[model samples]
Target chain A: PEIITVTLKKQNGMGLSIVAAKGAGQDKLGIYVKSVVKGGAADVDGRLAAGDQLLSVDGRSLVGLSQERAAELMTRTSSVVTLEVAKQGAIRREWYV
Target chain B: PEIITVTLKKQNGMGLSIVAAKGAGQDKLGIYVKSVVKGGAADVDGRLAAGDQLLSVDGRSLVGLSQERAAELMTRTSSVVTLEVAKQGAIRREWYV
Candidate 1:
């Protein structure tokens, strides 16, 4: 699987939320993008989208990670943050920060 | 929006997982199906899918509810259970128990 890296300056948040769990019909675990806050950093950048599954942050693997841990990794940083995201089927990556 | 009803016999579990939060580019709150446990009630039933946003369970609205609460509603049932789901753009529903 390829990884999409998103670079963003610290905005006190990622301007988005995530859900980590198993998917239907597959036993593999994943981290899914729940919502992107509008007018927020990620939202304004406009690269992140709903249903986007997160792969990692700053090269840290998110697979099999708890939702809380993933959120922590994303939020713990107060400086520039890089994100890796994956969507179903098609391959699409965006840049905004 | 139309609601898809899924009926499942109690399997001591919903055989599925969820993520409740905001979505990117949208302000609406929702409960997203993170993954469906394979061979579990929902997985074997084969209607529930990852990325599927949950609407309600047993006539109880899920909108604005916390993720924990939504999961509780689904797991609390130990008998036949009903679910309403929504997919993106298109409308598709399935049933299994």
Candidate 2:
């Protein structure tokens, strides 16, 4: 069997933000940017935005990707695929009262 | 040997916001909501604020919970002891210039 490796690239039309940890700044789980300061592998790519769900990497769904595995793959091969993200809900976004 | 199971809850006194991934939208790490959209265990509970430290899960401290272990517990149990979180600086929150 030919071992097929996956390589990702900085996707097009995708913007991410990097934030330095500080103050009440904590590393929560779930829908958070992959981050940089913490020294996670994805740090090299750039900052990830909050609310963006990691859809696929190198055409592979993140559904089965373990955090460690994701880190390994991203660290080893910087590539790209469909990073499906849901924009903030209008109600949630505008519920700033 | 003692195997203490730890669970978490959708905390109060904490407000969270969720955003959908879109144009110029990406999952940058360091900070973000542990969304319900992606159907991660954090979702069934509620929205996770963009900023919050995972200090300790069930009093054990997140310093040890692997993503998989964290998932199994967060998904299996619901409780809270200390969720260390940092507050955003007034500048970053209002740096709209």
lDDT of 2 by residue, A1-90 (tens): 111232324443123342221112223232224332333223344433343344444555544333444444434434343343333233
DockQ scores for all predicted structures: 0.07, 0.05
TM-scores for all candidates: the values are 0.47, 0.32
Instruction: Summing lDDT over every window of 10 consecutive residues in candidate 2 chain B, give the lowest-scoring window.
Output: B18-27
Compose the digit string of candidate 1's lDDT tens values, residues B1-97.
Answer: 4458888875756776665544433345577776677777888788778767678778898876654565567656647878888764354321100
B1-97, model 2: which lDDT tens digit per residue? 1122323344441233322111112222222233223333344444233433344444544433334444454344344433433332233421000
Best by DockQ: 1
TM-score (C-alpha) between model 1 and the true structure: 0.47
lDDT for every model? 0.64, 0.33
Best by lDDT: 1
lDDT for A10 (candidate 1):
57
